[PDB]
Every structure is written in C-alpha cells, then in structure tokens.
Enzyme design. Structure first.
Site, short mmCIF file in Angstrom:
data_model
loop_
_atom_site.label_atom_id
_atom_site.label_comp_id
_atom_site.label_asym_id
_atom_site.label_seq_id
_atom_site.Cartn_x
_atom_site.Cartn_y
_atom_site.Cartn_z
N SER A 96 54.21 -11.61 -4.59
CA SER A 96 54.62 -12.73 -5.42
C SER A 96 56.05 -12.43 -5.88
O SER A 96 56.51 -11.30 -5.75
CB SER A 96 53.72 -12.88 -6.64
OG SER A 96 53.90 -11.80 -7.54
N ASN B 81 57.63 -8.84 -6.61
CA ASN B 81 56.53 -8.03 -7.11
C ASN B 81 55.85 -7.31 -5.96
O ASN B 81 55.93 -7.75 -4.81
CB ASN B 81 55.54 -8.91 -7.86
CG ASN B 81 56.17 -9.59 -9.05
OD1 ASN B 81 55.91 -10.76 -9.33
ND2 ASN B 81 57.00 -8.86 -9.77
N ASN C 179 56.29 -16.01 -12.59
CA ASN C 179 55.69 -15.56 -11.34
C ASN C 179 55.16 -16.67 -10.43
O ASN C 179 54.58 -17.65 -10.90
CB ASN C 179 54.58 -14.56 -11.65
CG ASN C 179 54.10 -13.81 -10.43
OD1 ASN C 179 54.81 -12.97 -9.88
ND2 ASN C 179 52.88 -14.10 -10.00
N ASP D 188 48.55 -20.32 -22.37
CA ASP D 188 47.44 -19.94 -21.52
C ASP D 188 46.41 -19.02 -22.19
O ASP D 188 45.44 -18.61 -21.55
CB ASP D 188 47.98 -19.28 -20.24
CG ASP D 188 46.94 -19.18 -19.15
OD1 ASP D 188 46.26 -20.20 -18.88
OD2 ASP D 188 46.80 -18.10 -18.56
N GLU E 211 64.11 -9.92 -19.41
CA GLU E 211 63.53 -10.44 -18.18
C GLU E 211 64.61 -10.73 -17.13
O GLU E 211 64.44 -10.38 -15.96
CB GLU E 211 62.74 -11.72 -18.45
CG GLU E 211 61.40 -11.53 -19.16
CD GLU E 211 60.35 -10.87 -18.28
OE1 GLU E 211 60.66 -10.52 -17.11
OE2 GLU E 211 59.20 -10.70 -18.75
N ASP F 179 59.08 -13.37 -9.13
CA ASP F 179 59.35 -13.89 -10.47
C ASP F 179 60.70 -14.61 -10.40
O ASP F 179 61.64 -14.08 -9.81
CB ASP F 179 59.44 -12.76 -11.51
CG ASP F 179 58.18 -11.90 -11.56
OD1 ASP F 179 57.06 -12.45 -11.50
OD2 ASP F 179 58.33 -10.67 -11.69
N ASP G 175 52.87 -7.24 -5.10
CA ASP G 175 51.81 -8.00 -4.46
C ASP G 175 52.34 -9.11 -3.54
O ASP G 175 51.57 -9.86 -2.94
CB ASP G 175 50.87 -8.60 -5.52
CG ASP G 175 51.47 -9.81 -6.22
OD1 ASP G 175 52.71 -9.95 -6.24
OD2 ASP G 175 50.70 -10.63 -6.77
#
Length: 129
Positions: free
Chosen positions: A50, A46, A59, A101, A35, A52, A48
């Site tokens: 967003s 990202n 994110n 989650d 990562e 990280d 979109d």
C-alpha cells in the site's frame, strides 16, 4: 506544494479542521509536519504494497484507489492522486472521515508517537489565527 507552518495551519483552520472531533488545530498541524513536512506531494511506500499520500499520508489500503494495492478499499471514494494536490481539500475531507473511524488521530502513528500528549498549541503560535 510545500506549505509553511503557519500557512498550513491557516489553510486547515479555513477548511474546518480546528477542533474537528475534538482535536485542536495544533494536532493537525503537528501531524502533517511529521507525516509529510508540509508537502502535499509526499508519498511513502508501505511494506505491504500500500502507499500513503499527501500532507497527512492517507493510506491506499483503505482510503483511496491507486490501482496498485491488491485487495484494498477506497472508503474516501477518490483517486489517491487527489491527495497530492496543492488544494488540500481532498486530503482534509478524507482525513475528516479517517479521524471519525473510532481510533481518533491514533490512526496516524506519527501523531500518536510525536504529537499526542505534547503542547501542540505551539504549532500555531505566531500565526495569523
């Protein structure tokens, strides 16, 4: 801060990530490796909009606020910038909630594609654990 393989494992273990929700320490170390290559200040934009952040690339769309991800959440209640600290505390704490989650570590695509099903224990061999 760029951690050493063993240095981060120890750091994570010391922070209660070992077998957290059933994921042995090697999983967390392997994930961080792909990562962010163990760099707390790693960031990736990202498609979109967003972003990280940190060692486990958390994110902004859902977990932290960076003021530039329109219509997103801040489920971990922290500035995204906190995930870039040399102190991995914030990243570890937010990750602990992420991994709870429902999807487990599959929330981390790099983990699913590069650590899941492998001998992740090898990520902690030769370390002072």
């Amino acid at each position: 801060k760029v951690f050493g393989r063993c240095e981060l494992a120890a750091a994570m273990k010391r922070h209660g990530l070992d077998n957290y929700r059933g994921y042995s320490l090697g999983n967390w170390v392997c994930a961080a490796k792909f990562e962010s290559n163990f760099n707390t200040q790693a960031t990736n934009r990202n498609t979109d909009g967003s972003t990280d952040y940190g060692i486990l690339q958390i994110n902004s769309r859902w977990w932290c606020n960076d003021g530039r991800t329109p219509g997103s959440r801040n489920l971990c209640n922290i500035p995204c910038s906190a995930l870039l600290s040399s102190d991995i505390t914030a990243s570890v704490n937010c990750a602990k909630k992420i991994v709870s989650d429902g999807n487990g570590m599959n929330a981390w695509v790099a983990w699913r594609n590069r650590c899941k099903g492998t001998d992740v224990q090898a990520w902690i061999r030769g370390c002072r654990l």
